[PDB]
């Protein structure tokens, strides 16, 4: 009967809670109370990219730490040269309702999608000299919220329907679907080794998934509202999530519970974006108050504030070399910080 | 001191800038409409008279209209509704024949209250199309309005009942000093709907220009 299964599920949840309690012998704050603070981080704006004529919804660095891809609600996906502020490409979109971008870690392809429920893959390197639509991956019943390349032929996507998918690009088919969430999946982060990935959903939960096997390995809770952003710690053993609770949280996979919470009484607005700096000491979060806060990942203290956006900071990213920080906002601009 | 290739790259970037500006100029001279309505509300008839998002283009009096239908997208509205902030107007379709079918009118009222009082549409106006008035006349002749509105008092005739529904929908607006509701009664075979939308949009544009020049 349903009642017996409900009772068994409640018992298993209690068992998991007790197991997690047993492992909570110390807090990250207690252990990190004996290390020096990073100090005051005063990062300044080194560039301003002035092409878009609408709200920028997604940005993605290239692996060379010099090229960027941005997408705005005016279609017009733009590939930028950060060093010279040169526009390398301007790709017109078949649907202006774009919400995610991705830059393949080879530089040969770019992906984007949104309210059309399709993930479009564009080839950047063609004999004809123009950017062409290489693939249109259809199969999601909801909006596309995030997409990330694993290689030139594999891409992982998250949808408004409570599902993630892994797509072969040649064939144009879902190879494995991830079906555990009860709410819209909003974010998506790949592990550095590209064997696991974490997805945060509107059910106020994050899930660690195995790409090859195709099953939810772990589920992390604690947030009170939806999770909008998620990012892996550089070593792949931890990840940070940002929610509409005006809170970020750092979770550890091996301990299988929350380690830390980043919040302040003066912050009452949701978090749009989250990223780590190289070595993971700093945690950058873009908020709805037109601001980006820099937190010390080991000590809850706030290190800095990247002011300078006149509308909410919708996305940010850190280069693979760690030199700069890109932030794009609902103002048509995106800035580079150092 | 740039190298020759650097100068060529700068030239190509400037060409890209020129194209982007031209596209922005073209896009600004366009009227954006968000089409909302309950299931079977008749918004398909309006789309005639005028698997994710559906985009319909048309023109009227040299004015270009882009209508966006989001009814096929069943997900958390709170996560993509802000995408339509800045839309020129919202066209909300309600079927008048739905008063005695299943409380459908109450579902429509709840959706209208959610959209009208939404924080993203505080200054966005609503064109309210009340559809299926012939079927409504038939049913109201055969069935009472009190099924949907137990507190209704007045003639169980077409005019008073229709006016009652209109004011019931219009009183859900809790911001009467910021936005306007333009209500039109429509039917299956009609020709004035496009003119209705054009007139409402022109009024909205004039009011926006007055705000811009500072007269409000």
């Amino acid at each position, epitope marked *: 009967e349903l009642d017996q299964l409900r009772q068994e599920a409640e018992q298993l949840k209690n068992q998991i809670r007790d197991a997690r309690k047993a492992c909570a012998d110390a807090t990250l704050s207690q252990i990190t109370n004996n290390i020096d603070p990073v100090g005051r981080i005063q990062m300044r704006t080194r560039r301003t990219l002035r092409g878009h004529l609408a709200k920028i919804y997604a940005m993605h660095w290239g692996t060379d730490s*010099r*090229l960027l891809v941005s997408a705005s609600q005016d279609g017009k996906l733009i590939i930028w*040269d950060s060093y*010279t502020t*040169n526009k*390398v*490409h301007a790709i017109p979109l078949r649907s202006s309702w774009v919400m995610t971008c991705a830059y393949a870690p080879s*530089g040969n392809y770019v992906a984007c999608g949104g309210l059309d429920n399709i993930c479009s893959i564009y080839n950047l390197k063609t*004999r*004809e*000299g*123009n950017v062409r639509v290489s693939r249109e991956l259809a199969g999601h019943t909801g909006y596309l919220s995030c997409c990330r390349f694993l290689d030139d032929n594999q891409i992982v996507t998250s949808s408004g329907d409570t599902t993630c998918a892994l797509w072969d690009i040649e064939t144009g088919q879902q190879t494995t679907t991830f079906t555990g969430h009860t709410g819209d999946v909003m974010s998506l982060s790949l592990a550095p080794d590209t064997r696991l990935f974490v997805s945060g959903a509107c059910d106020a939960s994050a899930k660690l998934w195995d790409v090859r096997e195709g099953m939810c390995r772990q589920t992390f809770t604690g947030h009170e509202s939806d999770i909008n952003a998620i990012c892996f710690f550089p070593n792949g053993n931890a990840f940070a999530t940002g929610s509409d609770d005006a809170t970020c949280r750092l979770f550890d996979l091996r301990a299988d519970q929350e380690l830390m919470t980043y919040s302040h009484d003066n912050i009452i607005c949701g978090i749009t974006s989250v990223s780590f700096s190289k070595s993971g000491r700093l945690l950058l979060a873009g908020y709805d108050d037109f601001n980006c806060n820099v937190w010390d990942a080991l000590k809850a203290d706030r290190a800095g504030v990247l002011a300078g956006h006149d509308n909410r900071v919708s996305c940010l990213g850190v280069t693979d070399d760690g030199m700069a920080v890109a932030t794009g906002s609902w103002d048509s601009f995106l800035k580079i910080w150092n | *001191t740039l*190298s*020759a*290739e*650097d*100068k*060529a*790259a700068v*030239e*190509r970037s400037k*060409m890209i800038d020129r194209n982007l500006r031209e596209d922005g100029e073209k896009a600004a001279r366009e009227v954006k409409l968000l089409l909302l309505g309950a299931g079977e509300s008749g918004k398909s008839t309006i789309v005639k008279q005028m698997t994710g998002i559906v985009e319909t283009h048309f023109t009227f009096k040299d004015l270009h209209f882009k209508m966006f239908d989001v009814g096929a997208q069943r997900s958390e509205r709170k996560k993509w509704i802000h995408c339509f902030e800045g839309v020129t107007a919202i066209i909300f379709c309600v079927a008048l024949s739905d008063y005695d079918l299943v409380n459908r009118m109450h579902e429509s009222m709840k959706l209208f209250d959610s959209i009208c009082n939404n924080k993203w549409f505080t200054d966005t106006s609503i064109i309210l199309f009340l559809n299926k008035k012939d079927l409504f006349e038939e049913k109201i002749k055969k069935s009472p309005l009190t099924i949907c509105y137990p507190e209704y008092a007045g003639s169980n005739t077409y005019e008073e009942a229709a006016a009652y529904i209109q004011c019931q929908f219009e009183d859900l607006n809790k911001r009467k000093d910021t936005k306007e509701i333009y209500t039109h009664f429509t039917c299956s075979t009609d020709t004035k709907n496009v003119q209705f939308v054009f007139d409402a949009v022109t009024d909205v544009i004039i009011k926006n220009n007055l705000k811009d020049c500072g007269l409000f």
Partner: single-chain antibody
Amino acid sequence: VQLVESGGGLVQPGGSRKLSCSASGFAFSSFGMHWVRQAPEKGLEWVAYISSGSGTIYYADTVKGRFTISRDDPKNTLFLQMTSLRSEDTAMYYCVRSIYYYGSSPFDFWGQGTTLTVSSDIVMTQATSSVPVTPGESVSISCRSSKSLLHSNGNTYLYWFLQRPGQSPQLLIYRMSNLASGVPDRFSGSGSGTAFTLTISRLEAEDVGVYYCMQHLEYPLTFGAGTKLEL
């Protein structure tokens, strides 16, 4: 991708000729175009450049004031109007494609060319004019320049082209170290300012021909004499 030149022939001194190059297979409007020429028994000589958008025009000094370069993007045609022709203008003219953005490969595609018969720059030196070699061996071709080609932005603007018997030049290396698309990994390039080397490992057939080094640091573009490999 196809660039077909036409309009060549035999002219008397003092006459004029309008050469044309019909382009197909690519976004012609997005590419800058070059006119290059080769004398009957000599190396390559850069003639003219017209940029994408027709904003920038450059001419060689030997043709300035006489030649005019133009393009019709809708018809995908490139025109070279030559007036006051001299015996020095007798040559085969090639149209060359070139696109400029970060990471691009300019001078990537060359036409077949058309023959015309008339009745403070940087000097590139190809010290060796000929090199006999057997298949399976390694070869090294050297090129020198008057001034360092290394710019403050990190790029060394050296290009290596290979011209096989009866064929138009094809790009091997761009910016001294980058292997062109479709080129076997046998080829490699290295060097520092004023001294550059192209290394061919496991020399095979169809590598016979003339290798040219070109600088793209400053206009006018200048070629070396060309080093010939024969089996």
